[model samples]
Target chain A: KSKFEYVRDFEADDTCLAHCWVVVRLDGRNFHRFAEKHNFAKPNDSRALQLMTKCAQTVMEELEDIVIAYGQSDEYSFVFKRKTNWFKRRASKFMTHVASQFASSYVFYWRDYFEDQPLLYPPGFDGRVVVYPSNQTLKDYLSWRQADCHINNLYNTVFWALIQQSGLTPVQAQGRLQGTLAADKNEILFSEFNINYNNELPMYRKGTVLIWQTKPVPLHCDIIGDAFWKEHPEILDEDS
Target chain B: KSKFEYVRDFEADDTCLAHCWVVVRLDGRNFHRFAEKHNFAKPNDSRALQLMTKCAQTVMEELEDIVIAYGQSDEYSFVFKRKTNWFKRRASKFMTHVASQFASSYVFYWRDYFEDQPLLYPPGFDGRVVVYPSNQTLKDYLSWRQADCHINNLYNTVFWALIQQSGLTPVQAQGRLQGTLAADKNEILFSEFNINYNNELPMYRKGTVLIWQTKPVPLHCDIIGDAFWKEHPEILDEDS
Candidate 1:
């Protein structure tokens, strides 16, 4: 945790952690598009990706005093050493501002290249984002994942009742009233946040670091891979 | 089915159906709106109501040709007789065209005025537009009643997967990914003389009119008066 205690510690020249895994995959098609432009390490079609990473690095730099270590894959996980300082006072604001900035940057980037795109239903399988928390807040979020599904069902039932009661039939209704409406109302928004809770909860540490892969569904903290640095002889290599 | 055939004889009249329903339900909100504007009805907000109804009526007008008979509360139980005539073809095109237009209009109008527009959830339901088919499609669609949740899950899942898999970490991903990607992929596009399936299903005489209520759900179909129509035969006489 004390490793990245300074801004220079995380310079782009720093080698990626040998003990950690940085999952980098793309949608099948866009992955090809990305490969077409830039080197395999940093895809080209992703101006937003490049810009947002810079934004994230900025946040990390500002929190360097408190934030001890940061590990990011398809999602981010940063560990702070519970500092009681001016920086801790602005955690929520920091997250929101950076997140909002990411949103605006994305919107602006896509506006030009793909402005008038068509909407199509693509084929898919599971719908949950596996979370590998670096800290306990990420750990505490486990309970909410399971409770959300029921809440979604309730919202749908309420919405349907509203439709039936309102006596709105056929053309009188607005919007698509498409199948997505009920599902969105119930499952997507309040019912579920689609974040994996404890797939790899504590991440891997040199010794007591806990590791769990988020379950396919975020509901269960069903641990996937539990690994420690000691058990694997290969991982113990100091050079790694 | 044969009993409702008489309604189709007057399908040629443009203003007939709109004016006819208002004429029958003199106390209906639309009638009040029109009456106030044309000096025929006497409610204080009659003109305002008329404008509101006008928006709804315009949307409904698209369904008239295919709609054999429609009643209040937004249900259109109709018998669509095949019309090869140029005028009828034009009407069919207009109706289909209006289907999408009405959906957008309903969202803007109702959201801006009557109801706080619901936060849409699709793909996962946070703020997506879901699809809901009629009960008739239940044979093919697993979730006829649960269309909202089902389709939203389908969309939301794909979207988040796209974001996560982009080799980007969750925090590194854009919050706006769902809307920009989905909207671009699934937007409504116009196609003239496109290919279509021919089930060759016989003309609907009205045994069952599968009402596929698209979204921006309306609020007046089931409750106002259908129950009374069955109890009192004298009410049919009132139509004269």
Candidate 2:
């Protein structure tokens, strides 16, 4: 009779340890197929990028404890205040809401940003919750995501340039870019295409970092350096 | 241009104090119209009541930190563990997700629960988050909600009896029960209707209290008394 109650065992122990930086990352579900169907640009799309940044900004504005958020490609990472006790640090609660709000805002504001390309269908996102035990670890975690963004952007730029200018097929572009270092990619762009890698739009290289600057505003900057943190020390607590 | 960054100032100060019990209460939005259009029973509908309990149980099952939940009518109150840092104790994240999940599940499982009635429109719910500083206060909060359940259920019982038996209109039944006390309502049920008030269904009298009982199971009991908490002391932390 009470056997159905055993379903309670399915509950997971999701308590994030206390006094740590809780970071939640959300990614678009099946975004590659979604982007292709929606006719996204090959290398990058400003509208798609702006839509992600806009949604992340909405999340930071709506949820006050989020100190900063970084987004690249189809993913975004949100950092919560180190000392927040929101919902007693329940992982499911935190993760679900961030994904829910971010997805909802993306849909709600899609028309404002993407007037020409109406959403083909509702987009779904998957989210994960993680807690970093120290401030340095949290900073490094963000830096790692930013670094990945840079590497991917550089490769995509060079790969697409080969196809657009050098008349290389998609397969050929991938083969040419494979096993190339950052410097080689930059050199290829400068020598073959006469495009300086640094001259690319900051949005392409840095992705987007949305922080509460009197409000939630998106910034494209070098998260790898100390200058960004120095300029916005309020993003992290001193003890963090 | 850069002036748009000034919008970040709009972020709110929503830091929740540590070491407190956070409680979230969600209510059905525009439920009166929803109930009438759906043709709910006059006094209480078991199916509707069961649906609420089912949704609350899902919430308790899905959210680990929820120690106990009490639901009556169209509203439910969820008690989080005193130490939960869900979303860094961000009120918006906690409140939104509980309401969203409950509302979503309600719609998802509605057809199963309401086999005859087809959903005509989407339902909405509003939620609020609050924190309590002490065990006694938290207990008092539960007691307060339970007391409201008792008062409303008794009045509705008498009002419905007057209509079904005495052939009074809803307005007339409302007038007759306007200034009545609990004793008076029970006396009316016993004298004219010959129905013992205590013999009524426990679901109608005690509403529903879902707790983690080796499993999260719903109970209808006297929450105002110490016996329930005494029997299930594990629901609250020792220090709380």
Candidate 3:
């Protein structure tokens, strides 16, 4: 190789520290506009949501490094096994591969999910990689996302219910729930609109979690609690 | 906010952990081909190198979080202070902003460097963000790069000297340099070509280092040793 090639060594040592849980989180680029342009259902569109999960499934199936995948709305996080040797644990390789694979599958499976809607312009996603040091931290990170899912889903449920059921305009709905808490929103939905927040669709509230075994098993439930972990012991390490 | 607005919460928390030296390394995308087509000078091209440094300088100026930057050939690394709050220490924000700002400056200032050579196409670069936890680790990281620069520069210098001075073919030069070490190459250059490897350009041996003190002062010298740190105490933290 020529001197020009020596420049390749200038790339810093970005191989993530070993024995740390490697994560590559990807977010849709301007997905709100994408949903509006495609006439997605308010608050939640199963087609778009399902398409995203399908995209993530492709990544897990293709890249065996990802042990568990989580998704809510337009974002997905792939957690690799702590001792994975894929791409020599390089952050860019993991980030770029996860992004490109998911994006390609998003396009390839567009027609399958959106049978009537024409495949619009190519959608884009941006990603970043992180390393979590221990099982406790990784578990807490998952709980953070699932907790976010519950809070946001509850808020959005009431917001949209106000618009469609109570005839509250979009701006009026935001103002209506401006300073309300989860309990306050539940009260408004139950007393005023006869809607039970608990009765809302599980997928809308819990989000999608895919666990990789021989194949990916998609679940829409609580990962923050130990209930799921108790039933599926293989998802995380048995440190104890 | 309404239920629809709740999706915003789905964005994952990717802020890097605290008290760690953050590094964003950018490498030219397909730069080997880019250099060949752009007619970059063999072994070293001062104009191209200066332009890369200028682009990096623009990033440091526009984004004040960067404490120091290092460059060699088509890659540059910007190191942020250990306790930086820039963009709340999010990896994506830091990676995207640095890449875009550097890319913009590269295009904006392309004509200034390559006056005779027309910019044939848009150049691209891919980057990754990493965190080193302590002063000792960061010091070793910089030394890793500086040592790389020295080894690579020495190899190229002798290889090209063989082709240009001894009238050897490019392939023959590669074969001659193959299985040779630094001392052996120096011997060949001295006894046969009357060239002292130590007399080579310092910039060629050492990569460019930019220290930010209200403004960037570019220097080409040894960063692997204690001399540079001793001379510029402000460049690195005084751990002792």
Candidate 4:
């Protein structure tokens, strides 16, 4: 007879309390390096963006209780329905499963997206789980992420245009755009490169959202406004 | 040319708040099946235990700021110094690195431990980082883990003994051990099986502690007592 089974109780209880929506957010671990090694197109790469969405898609399909998810760049946020009792609502369980699946899925599905770019090495992602008490705050969280996407997209578009078109060094471009408003960035793109910032690809501006009707679907649109939420009330089942 | 680097400010400030000891705990992601699939020895297996320590050892080597670690079963607890500035003391950065390295390392090292048994799949681990404000609580954490080991080991030993020695069904073993005290279980082992629990291997009883002294050293002793703390005051840099 062996005597080691009692060790399972050593871990502390980290149950996410009820009346809160669980969010597991995954960020690439040194993804900047991963992107560099994998040859991701600067600023926005359709190949890399779709690969991340594919991982999130498979995660929802393979797992349960994920209602909707959002991703931009190397980060994605999965929002569990408010009433989910998945793994007894343990934060570690949700975060680990999401992280483990999402990260591994990235490696397994690499060839499908990169084709000739032989996955140089396995990429790693870190996950953090947080709970928001109300729907408004949760919407605010999504708003914050969307705003980040827009801010970064606008900057990358202008900065890259400055370098590739105007031949400004990265530091020089960064300095020129430093403290400049959205209008300033847009003027640079329009005046020098004649590119309209507002006409840029929706994927770059809106980020990506993975939702389900009957099957999982990907949408590139702004969730920060009231339209998406009102149109998709199924997202939040107010009550049973 | 990307101005997107400025978007890093959105994440909440999770710098462990200073004046606290950082703890990053890693637990096996559904290891019961991993153990079963690999045909691990029941109760206490040498290969399984050694593989875990090998992982913790590698973690200390690859990462900085880890002072000591304690592990039993599929979970390991790493202790960071009070003033560790690693990754600016962010919990996600620490947990992700530890999680990725430890989980991936297990896959790479599986051949060393289980030469004949092929790995069924890539296993996963989840991590939680917490901060304990003082040495007493940190030591209490270790004490709790050790006590868990003893309790589980005692119960598992008696249960298996009833099956192996007296040929009791699992149900019968459960019935007999129901509401039994430590004395009762010890008596059962000594009387029926001629086994003394304390005479068991220290590795089984004390769990494992990895401490760095010049190089990382593995110690199997009771840290709950004063002897360990007094013997290794270097563990806690009380001042500089």
Candidate 5:
């Protein structure tokens, strides 16, 4: 029965700017079957990419004004740069709404395709849209994960919450990946080597991790959009 | 985007109990109108009082754990001697759930009676429950209309917002009218009064009144038991 607050400020010292990178965490049990249906043997098939692209494009079209760019990662990234003060708030609200609609649409789309398979809804899969910025805080976030620590993927939500709860300023954070890319498919984690100018890293030491249900993606912690590809070179296939 | 340290507290202060004199508010616009059809004109009418008594009885039975006592004014008041830890959080959730269920049930009961006014869903009416104690705060809100200064029957949310934005602690504010009866339905105006507790009031000189779609009711707020009639000079006749 705790109250739900819609408007909130980022963590202390952390600041936001023009855009945010959102990472939607997929569930292993659910996404495993989901990806298989799209024929993702090792990723990168025209048909499979077409299906993924189609799904992402559906959401992007629905978020016409807000969704800026697209990428090929399982967790797609988009930029939100609205000109008007009201556009951000409006886009935020609309994105949340679209997330739910996307859930329904996703279910309907795969219903017949996976008729025999028991369809488990994705984590935090209420179809709620999450809007974020792609700014300095996000940049530092990406910078840290890019450094080698064997991290494959980070949850978009964890950093979102980190930005929400932390007192230190966050220049930017992004989705990073490490470990076995296959093993890290569904989980988003953090690392020590972030690149924020504030010199503040998520103090995973004493902080409690909160678990809440969101609508669109799984309840992933803030994801580390790390630099596994930079060090390993063969880890990622951006085209795939 | 902001941290969530104080969101719940803000909801509690704004939606339910602070910066106002009124203890509770209920939305029951159609109650009296519905009662008229059932011949519940006077408090004395056996059938009418019986129905009111039924409402009182139901509250007494259902809220025994929470209610210290119950009394009747226009409707009923089930007073809680001491607020429990669960009162604000869990109880608010329960109350909203209970209220919505009761609302739905009432509509069905009268569905046949008011054929032309059939029970139909509003655009977004759903059975989903929103559990938030912090989201329902309201104390007795005072506003001035063109009138003799008066203590309001219920809290005004506009005043509630002012209290929170000003960052003042909720210091138990209560206003009582010593009059035996409120025969005339007059708008309460706190602006013109002697304002005895004026020192403790939030830093606000005056406020303007506005319109709202869903208004609050005092009678149904604290479900009252029959014992309150001891303060009543006139007893309702069986048919009154």
Candidate 6:
């Protein structure tokens, strides 16, 4: 052994910024295949949606620092308090553990939600670290994700309805949906399909948002609008 | 809100196998500076060693699946059972949390171990997941690490003694000890410094091995030799 050390070279520099809200957004690996293999309902499945909510709840319970979680499709985003040094603010540590725990919970609670659909194989998730400097930025981040959920859900609602109600093939539906705006899709649903987009289940339209005051509760309200944020000011810490 | 899916492209693919021994090796991200800054004793410090052992014990207690851990210098290797589907066998999940929790515990218990050494800054650790297919391979893995500990400890022991007892500078000691084997180092210690290499503190010489029966216990023993393995057969599964 030389007098010089070599282990130092193996060290990595990946410490996240201190005094910032740490968010980890984890998405399922090959979830499209998973959805198809498991035969998830068109547009939205209540069971699949509830399963994601359950996984998010389990994450908050297991890791106390996680204050809130937002989930849509096979992805979940967890928000940790600004001051928590849970892995000493290491990005990889926080993201990986969050994704891993969420994936584990998904499998553990799969049978509870989908009694008939057995898990064909173990599922996995990948996580990325997102940092917000202030409560406003964190809110904006969540709002952006919620807006994404709204956009995807609205398009999917109309896309699948054309196939199911109007007897269009998957290819035909894809071609019919090309360059359609939100209003156009809403009008199509309203005028042709006679389905009011507003009457859609809030869970399907809005996705799931889990907030912890004392305990975590799932909400499917307008996260994009300011009403929910104004109503529950406790979601984001002001002093942080 | 258009009738087209976009979020599906963000999905990632990272999955570990169903039944395989998962090991996470975590090392301090920048421990050279940390140790020097904290004024840790050269060659080996009992307090530093004990602190690492304490942190490993906490990890096993908090995370139930870890069966055995081997540590030397600034690194620790944790062994999880082959059948454990913790986090659905996701490598990032297990490795990150282990590193994060261990890093957290190191900071949490730093004051208890080093009463005078207030931490200047937060410490971070990097974790990597390794998969072993069989018990023999895992045993060989631990044995290799233990052998490395022995080799390094012998050299460091002689190097430090020459500096402390013979008034040799670090560079002079390095020059004098050039191309020396284990026997030559032992001879130098025995003949010149009157220090028995075998009589060195086991915690420093052997490093730390954490094993769980009903609970976790840290032992500094001859893991390089077969004696410890033969005595604690329960550490590895028979079928594995």
Q: Enumerate clash totals for all models, in the order shown.
A: 64, 21, 1, 4, 89, 1
Q: Which ten residues in a row have the lowest lDDT in candidate 1 chain B?
A: B121-130
How close to the true structure is residue A83 of candidate 1, measured as C-alpha lDDT? 29
Best by DockQ: 4
Task: Give the Å shift of residue B141 in candidate 4.
Answer: 2.5
Worst 10 residues of 4 chain B by lDDT: B1-10
* Candidate with the greatest TM-score versus the true structure: 4
Per-residue lDDT value at B179 in model 5: 38
Task: Write model 6 residue lDDT over A1-240, tens digit each, in one string.
Answer: 332233323334456678988888877766798899999998998888898898788778866588788998877899898888887887666765565456546655677899998776555555567677777677777777777888898999999999999999999998999989889999999998999998999887888899876789999887766788788877664455
Off by over 4 Å in 3: A238-240, B1-240
Model 6 per-residue lDDT tens digits across residues B129-212: 667766766776777777778888999889989898889999999998999978999999999989899998887888899987
Model 6 chain A weakest 10-residue run by lDDT: A2-11
Across all candidates, the chain A TM-score values are 0.25, 0.93, 0.95, 0.97, 0.35, 0.93
Per TM-score, what order, best first? 4, 2, 6, 3, 5, 1
The RMSD of every model to the true structure, in order and in angstroms, is: 29.9, 11.7, 10.0, 5.8, 20.4, 14.0
User: Between the candidate structures 1 and 5, which one is better when assessed by TM-score?
Assistant: 5
Q: Share of real contacts kept by model 2?
A: 0.00
Shift of residue B232 alpha carbon in model 1, Å:
27
Candidate 4 lDDT, A179-219, residue by residue in tens: 99989888988998989888988999999999998778999
- Compared with the true structure, all predictions reach lDDT values of 0.27, 0.77, 0.78, 0.80, 0.28, 0.76
DockQ of 6: 0.05
Task: Give the worst 10-residue stretch by lDDT in candidate 2 chain B.
Answer: B1-10
lDDT tens per residue, model 2, B1-240: 332233233333354567787887877756899899898886888877888788787677766588889999988999888887766876655655576457545655566688998766545555566677777777877787777788888888888899999999999988988888789999999998998988889988888998876778889898878899889888774454
> Local error of candidate 6 at B191, Å?
31
lDDT of each residue in B86-120, candidate 3, tens digit only: 77888776775676557646755777898998876
